[PDB]
């Protein structure tokens, strides 16, 4: 909307500047503007989009967890009543978080995903779709909790199916997708065995393909493999 008058190239340039300045809200707005120009995004541009919103929602999630913990403590036995302020402020942060998720999901639905034909782009966007439904799921408590969870699962599953067909087992997008879908199983779907199985199988299949990679590709793949191992260690 407000970025309608700025050149696409200028928005991209400014997103990169905002990243350098750790101005992630600005970075997200610039990339939102870029997406709304209607052209497909390059790999670098998709990274700017994801980095920006990851940082924004990351901060909101951290704040929501702080406030939720305080709220939970206030509802324990022996806690002397403090009024509606804790709930109200947790709700405020929660609503802002949901707004950011809805914004990202909106961009994916209008029209990033439908125009993404290459495996690398389509999987990247579907992973994002899974991730932002997962963030919605983390705060969901009502009649829509189950549908939100299934929306996350559905997006992750479509991404997994394409990634298995079209990309090598060491592909960083394939690896990152599996990492996050594994976390979905553990943290959202109450399926810790599925989480562990997915992380293990992904790790082992990547290990067997490392021999094919250059030094630079090896670096990115092994970094994510270490995250899979970290989670497995956390869970076993």
């Amino acid at each position: 909307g407000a970025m309608g008058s700025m050149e696409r190239a200028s928005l991209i340039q400014k997103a990169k500047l905002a990243e350098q300045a750790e101005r992630y809200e600005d970075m997200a707005a610039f990339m939102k503007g870029a997406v709304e120009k209607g052209e497909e995004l390059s790999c670098e541009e998709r990274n700017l989009l994801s980095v920006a919103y990851k940082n924004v929602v990351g901060g909101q999630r951290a704040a929501w967890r702080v406030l939720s913990s305080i709220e939970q403590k206030s509802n324990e036995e022996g806690s002397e009543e403090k009024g509606p302020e804790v709930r109200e402020y947790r709700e405020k942060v929660e609503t802002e978080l949901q707004g950011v998720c809805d914004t990202v999901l909106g961009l994916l639905d209008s029209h990033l995903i439908k125009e993404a034909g290459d495996a690398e782009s389509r999987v990247f966007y579907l992973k994002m779709k899974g991730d932002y439904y997962r963030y919605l799921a983390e705060v969901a408590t009502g009649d829509d909790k189950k549908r939100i969870i299934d929306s996350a699962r559905s997006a992750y599953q479509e991404a997994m199916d394409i990634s298995k067909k079209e990309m090598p087992p060491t592909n960083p997008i394939r690896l990152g997708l599996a990492l996050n879908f594994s976390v979905f199983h553990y943290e959202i779907a109450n399926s810790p065995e599925e989480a562990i199985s997915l992380a293990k199988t992904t790790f082992d299949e990547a290990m067997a393909d490392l021999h094919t990679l250059s030094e630079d590709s090896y670096k990115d793949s092994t970094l994510i493999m270490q995250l899979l191992r970290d989670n497995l260690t956390l869970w076993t």
Binding site: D131, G176, L179, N180, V183, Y186, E187, I224, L227, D230, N231, L234, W235
Partner: peptide
């Protein structure tokens, strides 16, 4: 919390 990317 577990690692995601």
């Amino acid at each position: 919390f577990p690692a995601t990317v």
